[PDB]
Assembly symmetry: C3
Homo-oligomer: 137 residues x 3
């Protein structure tokens, strides 16, 4: 079955309207999902239903939405109201044209530009942002 994991380990900055980049690829199965390391783009090449999860650790309160083909997905936006705490969201979407593109967009954090942290809680390097996604139809 189709599965993809991507994550970032950097203190990248994301401005309103831009996407989270992922510098590393985890395990990828199947051929429906792909992703070029260093980009925020996740290419989807099979119609049907997908379930995506996102985690993002920033130094400020933030608001981020999953976006499909540049448009926010219904139920795809999550925010945190506490600094230095996780922003996490799981949501499903239907791909009706291929290739589609899934991104994670700074959908208007109040603070404006958001800077991620790969250092929270410990002295070792964290995943600062990640998406885990699989097809369910």
């Amino acid at each position: 079955t189709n599965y993809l994991y991507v994550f970032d380990t950097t203190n990248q900055s994301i401005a309103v309207g831009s996407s989270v980049t992922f510098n590393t690829n985890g395990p990828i199965t199947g051929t429906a999902l792909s992703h070029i390391t260093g980009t925020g783009n996740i290419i989807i090449n099979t119609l049907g239903t997908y379930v995506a999860e996102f985690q993002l650790q920033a130094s400020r309160e933030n608001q981020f939405s999953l976006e499909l083909n540049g448009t926010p997905i219904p139920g795809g936006r999550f925010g945190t109201g506490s600094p230095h705490s996780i922003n996490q969201g799981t949501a499903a979407f239907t791909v009706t044209v291929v290739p589609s593109t899934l991104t994670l967009i700074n959908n208007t954090s109040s603070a404006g530009t958001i800077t991620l942290s790969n250092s929270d809680g410990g002295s070792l390097t964290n995943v600062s942002a990640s998406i885990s996604i699989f097809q369910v139809g």
Copy 2:
């Protein structure tokens, strides 16, 4: 494959013992799982094992459990100790009678009734609560 995504976008209030309602259906596939918009009832019509995940953003610390037919699911209860911080949990469970109902119940938050926040961290509307569930066996 049986999958369901429902989510809410409101600042609803939830009393101790009441369920979180979901105003919006995301993708649902299969015959096992369903939900009527506006309710907090996810109805499960096929026996087997299910993996449910919930997310909830509230204006203060809270405690919620997934319940099945009115009974807390073992491992279905999660709390957070920070206002405007996400209460997220993932729990698997077995359905031995059908149809059965899955709810997300205020159970039992210290502050009493819990009001959600659909506006944390940004200027657009967030998912204030949601469930992602699929059948594994």
Copy 3:
């Protein structure tokens, strides 16, 4: 027809976790298939089928903390997660490939600055919460 491998384990205690130690889970949830096993009271998820697994963990501690998923004693790439807020969930979803069997998945205090971490089974409410948990399934 239904050979999905799936396991859910969770803990309901205020366990103390020294730097380098693993989160233990006192309770087994549903387990399907043959690949995955866990002896309660341990933090060891044993994996006896080669392939690719997705592991999600949740952890509720009284201080900010940094934990990593580890396989056979080595931190998994993309498996380390930290939060900067006390009494705030540490939540991470990562996927890894098991290249030898048996392999042991653990979740380890991979050096929170505060040192020994103590979980909370009581945040938010008057009932007992899941203070730590892992849900894992096989995708490849």
